[PDB]
Amino acid sequence: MLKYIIPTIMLMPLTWLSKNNMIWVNSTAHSLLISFTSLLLMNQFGDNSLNFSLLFFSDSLSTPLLILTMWLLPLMLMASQHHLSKENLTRKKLFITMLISLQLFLIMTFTAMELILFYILFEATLVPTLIIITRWGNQTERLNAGLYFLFYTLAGSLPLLVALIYIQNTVGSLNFLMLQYWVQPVHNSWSNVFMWLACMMAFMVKMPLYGLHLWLPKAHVEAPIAGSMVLAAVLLKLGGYGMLRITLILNPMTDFMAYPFIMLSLWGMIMTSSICLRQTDLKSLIAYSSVSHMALVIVAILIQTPWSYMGATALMIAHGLTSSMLFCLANSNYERIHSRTMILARGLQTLLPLMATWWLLASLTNLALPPTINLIGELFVVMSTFSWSNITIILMGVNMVITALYSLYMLIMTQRGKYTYHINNISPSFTRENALMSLHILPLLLLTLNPKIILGPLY
Template sequence: MISIILPTMIATLVPWFSKPQHLWPTTIPLSALISFFSLFIITPNTYSAWTNLSLLSATDTLSSPLIILSCWLAPISLLASIKSLSIQSHLNQRLFITLIFVILLALLITFSSLELSLFYIAFETTLLPTHTLIARWGAQKERLQASIYFLFYTLAGSLPLLIALTALYSFSFSLAIPSININTELSHLSLPLTTLWWLFCLLAFTVKMPIYGFHLWLPKAHVEAPIAGSMILAAILLKLGGYGLIRTLTIFFLPSANAVSLPLVTICIWGALITSVICLRQTDLKALIAYSSVGHMSIVASGIFSLTTWGISGALILMIAHGLISSAMFCLANLLYERNNTRTLSVTRGFKLVTPLLTLWWTITCVSNLGLPPTPNLLGELLIISSIIDWNTLSFPIITLATVFGAVYSLLILSNTNNSPFPHFISNISPIYSSEHLLLSLHLLPLLLLIFNPNPISL
């Protein structure tokens, strides 16, 4: 892990020492080099085996795919931002690139940390750079409100986690993950107290994902964020919650987890269904994609809360697949926004007539989002649905309807943006450039590789 963290630390300083004309040609290859090095941390498929050990960091089959996803999205987000940032001052460009690398560094430390105190610090470090991205480079005047929503929702949700970690340290005098036996440390406490401890841990992660009911900050943040902010937020930052939930369950399993799994799974599958229905009524393309992320994360959380191996494995697979697909969908939405200056679905339509090659990318992305065979989304959803139905047969119609409506709004996006009549009042649409085709292919190439070999993202 040191071979990845150290270059990332150096990369945060590179923009301030690069000449203006060499800024992007230097930072994008550097981030791509970090992505290449990250591929070497793929661990053998041995459950809970720590590898790449150092004093405070290590990787296993849970953290490795998320670290690789974080490193993979960094150069792609920079590539997607060149067009919008090239007209800004060099100071703004340097600050933007530095924030991207700071977020990447915090994510690497979060996913590889062996100390819960370091995990919490890195977990919270992602807030301020993301807040700055939304507030400074957002498209509309509501960006300040969206950034404040994002900051205070996640801060308020993380406070109980800090209390829980402080309580854990007072009992065990250690926050090192391999040395804590939480069942022993909290065995003398009553069931209500251990359940309260458990809920404190879960609150921070469910707000970060977020599941339905804790999601109010997410659509605003997505709609107002710049393209790089939307990509990183959807692809990686939402996965911090899923990672925290899985890590809490697999390493710190409590008997009280069974007591709260019933209401939590019920909330998650109902939230997935309600969010899928909400997506059908959205008029803003980015808001629709943002709400679809809430639905997918609710399904991921239901798989985790089922407390089964299939559910947790399906959650990890769906998190990785959703990270790539949602980022690609935001890129596609941004390409259309750059050409017609609106995200309204009634105007953003009929692009098949003017950008026919873009229709191919929309088709691949939307069918992957709805889980068409043989995409990894299908594998993750099948594992989660199987575990949920095995957990409680009565959940079958709810989870099935959520999946059906998920397919409906994915096809709705595809149909509205491509098949509807093109607006007659829009003219001078620029073609799709090679760099934009490269941007989309870099999102979908890993999906193709995972179709043939899904072992790197399975527990």
């Protein structure tokens, strides 16, 4: 992984040593080159994972998450450089540095062989994320959002640290390959119940699990646009990636310990989907949409079937591109009208025709139109959950109806009807904005041609 870690680190001197007026050009160009080389991680084998060294490895689960991560950095630089245009040079460079450091921690997080190396980098991502939210967020609420983000994550992750060290003392190793062969079944005792919760709650909070999600509508809404993109696209998926890994050592206890969290997710997805119908803040609506989608990933991971694991991997990738696109679309309106209220600016299809096409495509992927990879992931999860219990099709079916309703409600409210008379500063869409949207949707639809590369290790 050093062929990706070292180039990522070099983005920092590149940013600091660049000419003042070339910081965005230079960092964007070279971050795209790194993203291009990440395609070499697609050398996956049917039986064995691609094991680089004692520290790092990549299998079909981490590889797509790595490619998404490295793809997101140039998109975030494009999304940020407009609203940071009046920031002074040194603070711009520090903003880019936080983004680079977050990428460094993420790519090492997804390839860490040892769960305690995974833990340190998994917590490490908090620091740059907190700084981005609180320093460069726009509203007073960013300070409160940072505290909710920080202490929800740590309340869960500190018990995880105790559990992981306990496992290493008992097994002798936290190396993930070793745990595949030395894993022992978990006896059903009270002490193992709390080991199970310690190993899972930190990941549940990051998903987020319904009930433990209050940090997300604060953090995702108060962050700057780059903060929201990475928060929704990648950082929510650390929880899914962590759960997909750690459930290996929790069988068979997951059979019954899953029930309370499956109920929270199956009912929670309907609750959060309903909330979207009455949200007044466009960014807040998009944030609650993420909670509903990640409820499917939680359920898929907990029922532990080959189909649910393929579906979960696809959804995580599909949601990452879609939710990031929606935040970027919402941000482009915000940079014009300087409000997040959804009813403020209406009929934007009349004033911004091409941008209204991006809204439509973003909405259709969000409601999982076939054959998008959003639908492929959702379908595979619904199939596996039907086998877990036929009755689940009712909750899955209702959620798909509600999801269509709020996805198109967002489209209709903002893009259709009559334009707001007094809003007269809706200038034409910039080339930058149009390129930013198409760099989300084009890869998303291309993956429909070759879905296997985002179906994970069970494929």
